[PDB]
Amino acid sequence: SGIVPQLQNIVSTVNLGCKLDLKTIALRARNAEYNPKRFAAVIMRIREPRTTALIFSSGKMVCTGAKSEEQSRLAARKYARVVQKLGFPAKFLDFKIQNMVGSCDVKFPIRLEGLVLTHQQFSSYEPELFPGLIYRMIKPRIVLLIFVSGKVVLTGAKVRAEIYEAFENIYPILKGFRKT
Amino acid sequence: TVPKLYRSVIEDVINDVRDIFLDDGVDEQVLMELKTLWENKLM
Amino acid sequence: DTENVVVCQYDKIHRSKNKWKFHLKDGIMNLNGRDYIFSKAIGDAEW
Amino acid sequence: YQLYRNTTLGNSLQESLDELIQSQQITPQLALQVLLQFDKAINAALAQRVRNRVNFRGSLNTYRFCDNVWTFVLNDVEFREVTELIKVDKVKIVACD
């Protein structure tokens, strides 16, 4: 296909390497939310790259929302710099992308009920519950959400190649169920 | 409808602290000075 | 002259992406130097 | 909620009290007692007395939430009350639950 999955979301983690006083951070940093009674971590956002971080008192952090590996690492570097400037000796240890989400359009309708009937060992489809068919690919280990509209979502990737590979795998299968 | 609320609140507060001032042995004149200081600061 | 400030209580604060909606009540505002009051205030802002 | 103390109404009161404290006309304790009376009075008057609606739009510059208290800062805001416009370059909003 001249069809290329576009990355939509990446979740990464990194270890700042030092215990953090979350109350201090929530009171002094901008665009921060801290409600320990409901969630043990501070939720902070920045505009560039536009992302949301989850910062734990352990010093570990989760970065979400970026659309490229480089944006994910940059964003996390900024969060770490904010924490750094508030007075904590933050480091930047073991940065790692944990999940990547892609999406695309095959440009044609799909016979979902047909696909699930013939691919019972990889998918499940309950229209009343969720309008999308869930396909658990084994290689690569990626989960796809397939809609009758032809729109496709791919998630669970650790690297960009798995996203592209999973879509190349599913495309011919999907053509086999086009709607005519 | 705002100056009204303020008058309303100032009146209520002044009336409601009179006894406290009295129980403390503070001359009622001081209470009136409070109201005056307060109302004028609004202006 | 004035520090524009609003002191109130919130009913519901909502956000979708970078779209925030505020549902406020019992507020005293000082805008441009003047004083205002509201039983309810509804606002919209992009972050 | 000692929420409404840093308002025109509340601050003019505190300033007036500090003077009286300064000139030793009243004790700090008495001043505190007056502020306490003010809290009950302003809260009560707002809920039962005022009853109008306002609307505002602008760009959110910052937000913070800690101790169940929201603190925002909007830029280029437009406060709308039936009888029209109130424009401000910047406004800080503190809100208790």
Side-chain angles (χ1 to χ4, degrees):
Chain A
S1 36
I3 309 302
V4 186
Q6 302 302 298
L7 293 182
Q8 304 294 345
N9 180 37
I10 295 165
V11 174
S12 59
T13 60
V14 65
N15 182 9
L16 297 187
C18 64
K19 299 229 165 301
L20 300 185
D21 178 350
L22 295 190
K23 195 188 184 210
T24 301
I25 294 165
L27 290 175
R28 305 173 58 199
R30 305 187 157 230
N31 308 298
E33 297 163 271
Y34 187 42
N35 189 178
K37 76 182 214 300
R38 190 52 156 175
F39 190 45
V42 166
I43 302 79
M44 196 181 300
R45 298 195 174 72
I46 56 348
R47 301 189 170 72
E48 188 53 63
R50 191 164 294 261
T51 54
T52 296
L54 305 183
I55 308 165
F56 293 70
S57 73
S58 65
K60 297 204 173 194
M61 170 174 65
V62 180
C63 174
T64 76
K67 297 195 192 297
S68 78
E69 301 88 332
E70 198 67 318
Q71 285 180 15
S72 194
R73 198 178 179 105
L74 173 59
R77 279 261 177 179
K78 292 193 175 181
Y79 287 112
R81 205 166 293 133
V82 164
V83 167
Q84 197 170 68
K85 288 173 186 174
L86 288 178
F88 303 87
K91 299 192 241 299
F92 202 73
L93 310 174
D94 310 298
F95 171 76
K96 183 178 182 197
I97 289 90
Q98 303 292 359
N99 185 39
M100 311 176 70
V101 184
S103 68
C104 52
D105 191 339
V106 300
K107 293 288 202 293
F108 66 73
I110 306 165
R111 280 173 259 129
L112 296 193
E113 187 56 55
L115 177 56
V116 71
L117 280 161
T118 67
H119 293 76
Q120 75 285 165
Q121 304 293 301
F122 298 100
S123 62
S124 60
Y125 170 53
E126 198 170 322
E128 299 245 325
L129 185 62
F130 184 65
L133 180 149
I134 294 78
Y135 196 107
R136 302 173 183 280
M137 199 174 282
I138 301 298
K139 182 116 194 289
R141 198 175 115 192
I142 290 295
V143 179
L144 302 79
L145 299 184
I146 304 82
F147 305 82
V148 55
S149 68
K151 294 298 190 61
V152 178
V153 174
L154 308 89
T155 184
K158 274 285 195 295
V159 300
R160 184 187 287 265
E162 299 168 347
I163 292 300
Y164 294 152
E165 175 181 0
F167 182 70
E168 287 298 308
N169 286 353
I170 215 182
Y171 191 67
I173 294 299
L174 299 178
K175 284 202 282 195
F177 296 77
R178 179 174 194 163
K179 277 207 218 157
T180 169
Chain B
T1 186
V2 168
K4 308 278 184 303
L5 183 109
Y6 290 3
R7 298 309 165 221
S8 189
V9 175
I10 293 182
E11 294 305 352
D12 295 348
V13 178
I14 296 302
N15 285 326
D16 280 300
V17 302
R18 185 159 275 119
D19 293 336
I20 307 182
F21 271 54
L22 296 174
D23 295 348
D24 264 327
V26 174
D27 190 298
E28 177 143 18
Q29 288 200 308
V30 186
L31 181 64
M32 303 312 285
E33 204 188 319
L34 180 60
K35 184 181 208 210
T36 299
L37 286 176
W38 190 6
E39 306 184 328
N40 300 326
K41 257 155 195 192
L42 269 179
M43 289 191 280
Chain C
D1 196 4
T2 294
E3 165 168 1
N4 313 288
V5 177
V6 172
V7 177
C8 61
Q9 298 165 50
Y10 63 85
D11 277 313
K12 282 284 182 69
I13 299 299
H14 173 79
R15 174 197 71 74
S16 278
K17 284 285 175 65
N18 74 329
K19 308 302 174 204
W20 293 70
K21 292 194 192 189
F22 320 73
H23 291 214
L24 315 173
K25 72 182 182 186
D26 298 340
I28 292 180
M29 316 186 256
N30 184 260
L31 314 166
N32 304 310
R34 296 279 297 274
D35 259 40
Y36 308 78
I37 299 182
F38 67 68
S39 58
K40 274 192 58 208
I42 293 179
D44 287 312
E46 285 190 12
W47 180 82
Chain D
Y1 297 91
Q2 293 181 35
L3 185 70
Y4 312 90
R5 296 197 185 182
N6 191 82
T7 53
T8 302
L9 190 59
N11 281 305
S12 50
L13 174 55
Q14 300 198 58
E15 295 161 9
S16 303
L17 290 173
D18 288 306
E19 287 197 55
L20 297 176
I21 295 162
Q22 207 265 277
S23 68
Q24 307 190 321
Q25 282 177 285
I26 69 177
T27 65
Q29 181 64 200
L30 183 58
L32 176 61
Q33 292 295 347
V34 180
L35 288 167
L36 288 181
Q37 192 56 50
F38 167 76
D39 296 327
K40 304 190 181 191
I42 185 59
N43 278 285
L46 285 176
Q48 295 303 307
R49 288 292 304 271
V50 191
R51 182 172 294 98
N52 56 315
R53 174 169 161 182
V54 175
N55 293 307
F56 67 107
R57 185 181 302 257
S59 76
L60 185 60
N61 185 315
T62 60
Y63 64 76
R64 174 188 285 84
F65 181 70
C66 201
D67 282 305
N68 281 287
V69 168
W70 283 97
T71 299
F72 307 105
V73 174
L74 291 278
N75 284 118
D76 309 329
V77 194
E78 267 175 48
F79 292 84
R80 183 134 302 172
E81 183 163 28
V82 177
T83 60
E84 282 314 299
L85 204 83
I86 308 190
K87 291 189 171 177
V88 61
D89 289 3
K90 165 208 210 177
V91 61
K92 184 200 191 78
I93 302 178
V94 182
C96 286
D97 177 31

